[PDB]
Amino acid sequence: AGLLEGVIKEKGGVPVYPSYLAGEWGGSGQEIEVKSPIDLATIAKVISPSREEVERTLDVLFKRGRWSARDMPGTERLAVLRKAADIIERNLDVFAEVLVMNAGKPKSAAVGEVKAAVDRLRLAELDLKKIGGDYIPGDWTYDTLETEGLVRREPLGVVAAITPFNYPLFDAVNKITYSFIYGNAVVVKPSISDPLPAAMAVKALLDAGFPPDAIALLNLPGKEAEKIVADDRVAAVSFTGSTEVGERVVKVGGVKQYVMELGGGDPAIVLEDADLDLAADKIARGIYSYAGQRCDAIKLVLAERPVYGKLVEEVAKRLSSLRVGDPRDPTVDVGPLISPSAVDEMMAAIEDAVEKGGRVLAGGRRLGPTYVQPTLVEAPADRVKDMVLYKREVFAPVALAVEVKDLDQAIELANGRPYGLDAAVFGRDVVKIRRAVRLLEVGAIYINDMPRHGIGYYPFGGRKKSGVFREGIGYAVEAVTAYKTIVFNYKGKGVWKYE
Amino acid sequence: AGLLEGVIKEKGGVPVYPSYLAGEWGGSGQEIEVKSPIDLATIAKVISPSREEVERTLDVLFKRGRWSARDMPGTERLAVLRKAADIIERNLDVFAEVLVMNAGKPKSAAVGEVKAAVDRLRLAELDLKKIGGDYIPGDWTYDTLETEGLVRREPLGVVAAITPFNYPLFDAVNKITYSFIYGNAVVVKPSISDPLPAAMAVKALLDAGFPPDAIALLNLPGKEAEKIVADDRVAAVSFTGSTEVGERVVKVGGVKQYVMELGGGDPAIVLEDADLDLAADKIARGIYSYAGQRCDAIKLVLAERPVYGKLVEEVAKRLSSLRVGDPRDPTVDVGPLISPSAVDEMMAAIEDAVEKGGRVLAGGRRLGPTYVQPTLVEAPADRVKDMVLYKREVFAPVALAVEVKDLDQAIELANGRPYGLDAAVFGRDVVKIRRAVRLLEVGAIYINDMPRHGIGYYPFGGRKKSGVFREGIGYAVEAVTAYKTIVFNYKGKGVWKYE
Amino acid sequence: AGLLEGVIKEKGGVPVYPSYLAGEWGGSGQEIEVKSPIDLATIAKVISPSREEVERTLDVLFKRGRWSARDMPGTERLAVLRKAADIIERNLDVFAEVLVMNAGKPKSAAVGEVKAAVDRLRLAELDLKKIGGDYIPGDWTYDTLETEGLVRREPLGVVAAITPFNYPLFDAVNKITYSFIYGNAVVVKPSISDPLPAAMAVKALLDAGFPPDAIALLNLPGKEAEKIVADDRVAAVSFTGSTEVGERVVKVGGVKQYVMELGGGDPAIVLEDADLDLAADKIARGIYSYAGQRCDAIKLVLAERPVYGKLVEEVAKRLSSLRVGDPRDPTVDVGPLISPSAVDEMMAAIEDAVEKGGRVLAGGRRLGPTYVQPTLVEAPADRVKDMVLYKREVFAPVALAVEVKDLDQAIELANGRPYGLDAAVFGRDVVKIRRAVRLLEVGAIYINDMPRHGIGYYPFGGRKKSGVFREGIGYAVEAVTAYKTIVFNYKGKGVWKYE
Amino acid sequence: AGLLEGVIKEKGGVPVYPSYLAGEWGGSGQEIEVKSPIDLATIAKVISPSREEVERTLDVLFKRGRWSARDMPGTERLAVLRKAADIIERNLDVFAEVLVMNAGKPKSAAVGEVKAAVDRLRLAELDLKKIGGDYIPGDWTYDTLETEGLVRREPLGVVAAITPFNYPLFDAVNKITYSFIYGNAVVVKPSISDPLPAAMAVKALLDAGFPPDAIALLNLPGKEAEKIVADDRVAAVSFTGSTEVGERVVKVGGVKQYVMELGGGDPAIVLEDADLDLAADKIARGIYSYAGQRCDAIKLVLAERPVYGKLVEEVAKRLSSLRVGDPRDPTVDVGPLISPSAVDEMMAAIEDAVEKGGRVLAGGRRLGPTYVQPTLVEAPADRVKDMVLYKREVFAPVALAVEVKDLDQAIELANGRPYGLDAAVFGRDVVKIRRAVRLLEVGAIYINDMPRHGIGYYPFGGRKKSGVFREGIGYAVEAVTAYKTIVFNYKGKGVWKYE
Numbered sequence A, B, C, D: 001a002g003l004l005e006g007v008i009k010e011k012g013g014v015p016v017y018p019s020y021l022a023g024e025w026g027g028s029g030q031e032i033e034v035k036s037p038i039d040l041a042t043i044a045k046v047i048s049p050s051r052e053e054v055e056r057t058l059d060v061l062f063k064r065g066r067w068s069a070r071d072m073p074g075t076e077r078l079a080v081l082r083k084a085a086d087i088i089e090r091n092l093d094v095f096a097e098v099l100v101m102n103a104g105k106p107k108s109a110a111v112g113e114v115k116a117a118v119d120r121l122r123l124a125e126l127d128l129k130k131i132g133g134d135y136i137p138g139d140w141t142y143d144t145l146e147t148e149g150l151v152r153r154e155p156l157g158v159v160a161a162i163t164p165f166n167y168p169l170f171d172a173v174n175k176i177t178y179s180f181i182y183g184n185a186v187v188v189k190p191s192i193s194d195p196l197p198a199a200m201a202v203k204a205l206l207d208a209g210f211p212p213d214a215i216a217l218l219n220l221p222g223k224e225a226e227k228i229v230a231d232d233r234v235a236a237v238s239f240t241g242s243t244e245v246g247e248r249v250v251k252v253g254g255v256k257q258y259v260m261e262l263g264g265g266d267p268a269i270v271l272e273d274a275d276l277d278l279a280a281d282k283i284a285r286g287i288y289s290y291a292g293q294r295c296d297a298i299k300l301v302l303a304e305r306p307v308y309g310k311l312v313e314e315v316a317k318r319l320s321s322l323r324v325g326d327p328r329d330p331t332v333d334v335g336p337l338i339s340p341s342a343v344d345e346m347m348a349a350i351e352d353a354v355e356k357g358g359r360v361l362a363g364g365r366r367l368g369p370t371y372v373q374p375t376l377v378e379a380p381a382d383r384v385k386d387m388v389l390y391k392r393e394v395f396a397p398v399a400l401a402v403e404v405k406d407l408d409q410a411i412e413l414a415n416g417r418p419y420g421l422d423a424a425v426f427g428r429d430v431v432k433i434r435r436a437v438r439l440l441e442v443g444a445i446y447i448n449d450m451p452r453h454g455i456g457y458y459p460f461g462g463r464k465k466s467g468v469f470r471e472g473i474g475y476a477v478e479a480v481t482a483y484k485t486i487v488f489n490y491k492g493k494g495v496w497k498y499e
Ligand SMILES: NC(=O)c1ccc[n+]([C@@H]2O[C@H](COP(=O)([O-])OP(=O)(O)OC[C@H]3O[C@@H](n4cnc5c(N)ncnc54)[C@H](OP(=O)(O)O)[C@@H]3O)[C@@H](O)[C@H]2O)c1
Pocket: B162, B163, B164, B165, B166, B167, B189, B190, B191, B192, B193, B220, B221, B222, B223, B224, B225, B226, B229, B240, B241, B242, B243, B245, B246, B248, B249, B260, B261, B262, B263, B264, B294, B295, B296, B393, B395, B421, B461, B462, B466, B467
């Protein structure tokens, strides 16, 4: 709508969103329904591209898009991104409504994602802190004497941005931004679950001046996207999604540069000297935000004996006072999960915990096909490691609570999951904090706050099953750029006099 | 021998080299013959590890090796590497003899590789220019106000170093060095073709103090190594080899950090204003060194009309005056190719060129199962692109010569191969040079010199089919290390007064 | 005017500009006339502050201004600068008119300075590439084992910005920008000759939100400014002016951080392979722009035998076709010099050159008290070094032309002046260029272009008599900021296990 | 002796040390006695250079020394420094004996300084982390479009190293090392009080290969050194000494690059949660080491109410159990002060404190012309600020103890002195620590340890009266090096296609 007026076609029924084929919106492949977790109803359809159009798009992106993007000076590229931000911002409510509707995201969380996407675009100027190579004089070795080196980065070419359902707007804007600010062409592939926000952003970008042959948005479901990843014209693949899909992506792609943000949940550690008010408050929010559908959501809480009681009590109270329902009501604190399937898994995981010695301390009641209460399950340390909620990531509002004797047990348990994205530690003692910071095997540690990736003001990414490489203002240059080395030989030419 | 006295076991016949299993030398798997390209004779045997020993080694490297390496302070780790250099250096001739014998490398080139390996170890102190994270103050965004960030690198854990046959000693030492200087454990997997130099270096390292449970040397042939790459305890894979094997490696490994140095040959461009003496001299050497068995070997020469004649003439003269035979004779300029198979391919490729309009300008005569003359094949521009010598990398001393009308044709042809490792340009005009530097799609460009990776004083790596990521003093930190972000939240705590 | 309506007071006669005293505009000291080089007429008066007000201002800047500036978050500080840019830009013509009138600057050059000042403000976001300290792990020495370091920069406090007459608007905005973007308070002290543009910018900044107690503009003539430089509350002094005044400034200030941009002219070298059209064009402009009143103005031209003739001829033609007069006429190419005194010196210097063997090739005729023709004086190498035009900087449109036999003589002569700000070299041979780049003792070298500092997109500053330290986007952080080191001791505390 | 055999001349009596005149040892100026604080006896004489020899030395350093140093490749320069370290190390005892004798330094502290000097030389390889400029692409502004920049550092030329009496060997080696590793020539000017260690180091360097015309050691007393500082051939001045002398140095030198390490003492803050054992132990040592003759010595202790008692008690006990006397006895903990004059001042300062309400808690008794007891003087907060021991730096083993109500009072008092070199904070709460780190106006803060500059593994330097700029591995490059900018103009030349 609004910016998509000429694009969207209302074929008797729901609005139909076509793919962008690096030049023109279209698509001749199967049409696919897009539903809302609020009521399982169809709110639109997206046109997927035919194999022939995928092939043609890639050919355009490669043969022409790489140069449109690279040959547009940086000052112009940034102008494009700044303009795109302006457009998205004046269409805020429209962007947010689609998020609430398509993603089942509470109105406040939906507004937050639009603002993040706007800010990310505007702050592309900070990504520039990573522009500018290195000079390497040669007189520090006899073999390189009277030699000189210059190392600078160049865009790889065509970057494939694969996006998850839980941040349908931000992830797309984020990847497009860091790929473009450095001069790359981009193939965006959003979750078929909620691909509407991505189409809206791509249009805003095109309206803002983004080289028409340098970007693409293909509505391809799951494995049909493999055609893109495996293509040799795709020099990089920026993927945010599940460990399991990420694995398949690399196996299909083969040699290329990758950024793999594979989530998993995060553990939170509470030391005896922690401000329990802050802790309880932050931990509770970390558990339920967006119905736990945040890769940086808290899935396990670990607290030392002397504060475990209060802490768990306060968090349980907090989770209990939450209001569930339709996200539209700014009254509601928690909306629905992306699918009934996801709730099924959460219920099963809660049963498993109880059978293995676990006790629910708050929530636990399913309220509908896609509605559930944010849950907090207590578990004894000697039994938690075998619980599904521990061993795996149950993408839902549910966390385990475990009493520990000391920091070492806290750390050990925190590290015992197969993931290593972020971790949180509340407490005040520098030494204990330092210890934790060194031994927690995660990409990021939040001291006295819940894990919050934000727009990547601070880089993030995983360790272990949570992936490889980071995303962040500036740091993302490593995934979409390659080094170029220039060596000059002046031996005997008289520049230097033996040196 | 010497440092391998207690290790090597002479079971009636040839010396038998066991694998190092992160603690003790051994192996209960098939024994494999190691032959010399000088006379196809068996010079030794290596003991491959059983699946059970591979499993056990990885378990040691992971559970214990990661910590031995990480918990050894850096000052101590560097001492180890410096010591290892001392040991290899006093055993120079021994190391070189094995290179000449096992790799068919001319005595001078063999001495050069030992010296490179010694220097690489000693210069691990320069890799330290990449130690030391980033501080990120939070007041440049309202959402991060009263927040702070610290980003530092940590070793990934266990790094798998897969090595090629043409630099059997250097590549191994190089990878072990940058992996260890940053605190990682390493599984070295040398080419089964010439795994002896690697065993010698590993022993020197162990003798020097390298944590015994933090390193491994497994004599596994080709695909049996996949067991290592695919294992989850292997967090990184540093691979130097062929495009085709590299592809398989990533597909087997899945998500992990990779450095893929996939070679291919390099093109050399000669402008009308180039010093043709230097050019001819450097280009000829770039063509024949180590019998063209250098990933950075020149495979194509492009020269502007007015100098093509002289240039090709001078290079042909030079290639013609070379002496072939056994590498032992410091008289010989060119030894044998690693296998008769490699020569077969070179002969076939030369035929193909001639059939497609090509004419030999020097060499072309096979001198034995593993001996051939360094060849220079002339080809008209309108026909070279379909020639096997162009489309592929014929790992042998053979290059195509092509006359071009101008720099644009030179660049176009240079970029027309599927590889993009390095490229060379001889000439003096800044503008033409700048143009070439911008448009040549390669990891590195050598101005007025032949492509020479050396010890990585200047980083190198490929573009296109030549791979992803770089190796170099300092730059290699990106492949064996991961970022750790620490975010501190001081909101309302009184550190800052609104700012 | 416009933004200065409430500020400027028209006391029967000319407009009277008061000083800004870190809180309120005012001043109780002598009033001073401000004249225009276009007609020696008084166009305004500035109120200088009393010793008591200087003292009070410094006390405010120190006790309160340092914190207003430091405690304003960066995101807010940048907003202030961006806003200030908007204000100056909408008042462009007003800013430019005052420049043309007060500085005698040609309308186009005046518009250029306003745009530079606007751009400099807007690009303060690029100065941020220099925000963010260093982490220093301690295990690379035994004595620092189990220790850790963090190094970050902090604003020094109160920065004194002393400004020259030739870039009355830019220099002021530039210094205020880099001092403020990092959190410092600023005392601006413009040339009493043309202090009006500075007052206009300061007002725009105050209007934009600049903490009122964190900035000051004092109309103090020459030596009366010493009171500021010598004060201990002034932690830094950013000075752009003459070598001789800079010398006095440091001697008065004593220990503090300084940036000393002391100008002098620049030499231009033309090699035999240079595009003489470009060369002649750029060199001529470098000679006459703003009537040679540019610190980066060309004062000496050196060309190799074979091109000297044409080059000097083309430049002479060009200088000859220039139109002199009042700057207002967009027809005029050259306006007046800041004072008749400056012309006196130029005429004397031209006489000296001729007496010492020099011959005028273009210009030489004085056209009025403050008007002169852009001059080009030929001089034989064996006699040029004793000429006033060589030994000194004659701030006027005049340069020496000298034929040389080769690059070495060119370089030698270029380096023979007491200054070392910038230098220019036209030619195409990489080796000769490299040679020149290494041996020219200057802060900056321009290849195939005239020296052009611009807004400091590329850092600049001098060597020898041209000063110390640089100014530039990002690089200026060194002059207004100080390092803070934080060392943490964890010995025996259990963070590390021997390492 | 030993390495000074041919140099030192025993003219009937004490050994006579000549100055090194950039080529040959000598000197025709007044001879000066060098005495030992252990017994006020003359242990040697140094030959000062005549004005004519100073002039000649500078001329050599400038005309020839700059190039010997710059034209010696870095790999060779480092070899020189590594060799010099070897020589000093094998002559350890000799170096230490002279320190104990000439500086009155306890044998252990003397051995420590020799080891520091050895390590500093060997670690010059870590200074290399600061070698290698910046590439600046031009397409981020329209005015710099099709332009490019390269910024690299060059040695300034001739660096003057002025050294203090308390670290007669280290400071000299330190300054020579960072000046030389980057390619500068050096004029060393040691304290006339104890210039012997410097002569020994210079000889070791000359023996190690240091270009003979690139270094100088001039035995000039106080103000006679001004001749050096004021000379235009001296491009940099690295000075470690008193605030007052530093001030004079800059006023004499004028415009040049300076590093001013002006000391003053340091304050130590003890929070209620601090390990009082560690605190007391570190604080006591910080008070008495080298008889308080350390610029980083503790002069003021501030502890929160609840721990003040114990803390002061434990420190008093510790200071009391110290043994004073001749430094030779490894039994002695404290040797003499450099002169009786220094003790006079300490006694006067202790009287002043008592008169103003202060009470001695330990020590206070003078034991001889140059011997005193390490003292701890208690003072009430409401009266300490007017005490001489607070307002000034009494270079002796004496500190004030002051009870405070909270961190804010601690910080306020800590910041109340005119100095700002380092500061120490003992405690464990992150927030309180963070607060202190932000508000303490010093160049460096030591958390849970006494201020210890060491060899500059972590950079240090002052704020306020303690100076400007830092010294440290790597960081010192800023004081002895200058930037060189190279801008390339390719406008319309066809490198870029509009970008
Ligand atoms: N890019 C660079 O910087 C660079 C540098 C040097 C060389 N190279 C290139 O690399 C090649 C080196 O020669 P090469 O003939 O030895 O090539 P290669 O066969 O590709 O070398 C492969 C290395 O990988 C191992 N390997 C083979 N199959 C494997 C599998 N399925 N799984 C895991 N590991 C496997 C090999 O062991 P086995 O010996 O047991 O098969 C060998 O150690 C050349 O093409 C050269 O151009 C590139």
